[PDB]
Design a protein around this ligand. Sequence first.
Ligand SMILES: Cc1ccc(NC(=O)c2ccc(CN3CC[C@H](N(C)C)C3)c(C(F)(F)F)c2)cc1Nc1nccc(-c2cncnc2)n1
Length: 270
Amino acid sequence: MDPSSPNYDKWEMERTDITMKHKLGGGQYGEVYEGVWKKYSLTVAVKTLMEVEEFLKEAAVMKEIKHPNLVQLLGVCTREPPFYIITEFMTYGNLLDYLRECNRQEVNAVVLLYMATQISSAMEYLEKKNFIHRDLAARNCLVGENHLVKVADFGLSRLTYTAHAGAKFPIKWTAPESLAYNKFSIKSDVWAFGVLLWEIATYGMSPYPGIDLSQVYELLEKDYRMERPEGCPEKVYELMRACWQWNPSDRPSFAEIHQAFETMFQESSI
Ligand SMILES: Cc1ccc(NC(=O)c2ccc(CN3CC[C@H](N(C)C)C3)c(C(F)(F)F)c2)cc1Nc1nccc(-c2cncnc2)n1
């Protein structure tokens, strides 16, 4: 793009500079393909495409966020179709499958704590920027080298999720107020993070195992909560339970959650 042009957008890039390849993850992520940013011999993920409106809205949002633990936008091709959104490629894929397939001797308790800590840092940042994630879960996180974890948003509800409020929501990761009044806030993200902590502590088990979705709400309303997973430190579980406070205002903020994790991780890792 012309730096002098009235329409200059530093994020627009040459579609030709990308060598699109196979769909990413057997097509589990939808219209996202593996690609190579020629000029750098770099593997990247390229999401392509009247969801053109929603699409551009996503691109615009991604240009406003930068954090070491949030998937990194690398560039866009929204000059003309086909529209593109390019981000970095994370070597080991989504956190859910990673937890299920890892070497548990390698991904030990210190590492699980490290992952939680990185995720809360990303969420603390989003909190600060007044952004609401809406679908925080392990399936929406990426893992890189050296147990690097970044929060992403793959818009999976259209690709766990069940018909609800017109749309499709992951009932087991959704806060009560969100299920009841469709009220989404950073506090409902805080509830989802708690469930995510449970997913990590269990190396990727599905939440409320065996419990049918239709009973979840009522159960939550009657104060039922998932039990401390085997081997999950009491302090962590204590954090899970606080994130699951029935009233959002009673749930801790991400800054506070991050704070608590930093403390714990350094204590175990030293
Ligand atoms: C190609 C691509 C295009 C757009 C995004 N967007 C976000 O993650 C993405 C979009 C929007 C937001 C934020 N908004 C603001 C509020 C809004 N909600 C919904 C109301 C969400 C986020 C963030 F992480 F910040 F949460 C991420 C990510 C990828 N990357 C991508 N996609 C699938 C699989 C892989 C992949 C990479 N490496 C290895 N294997 C797989 N990479």
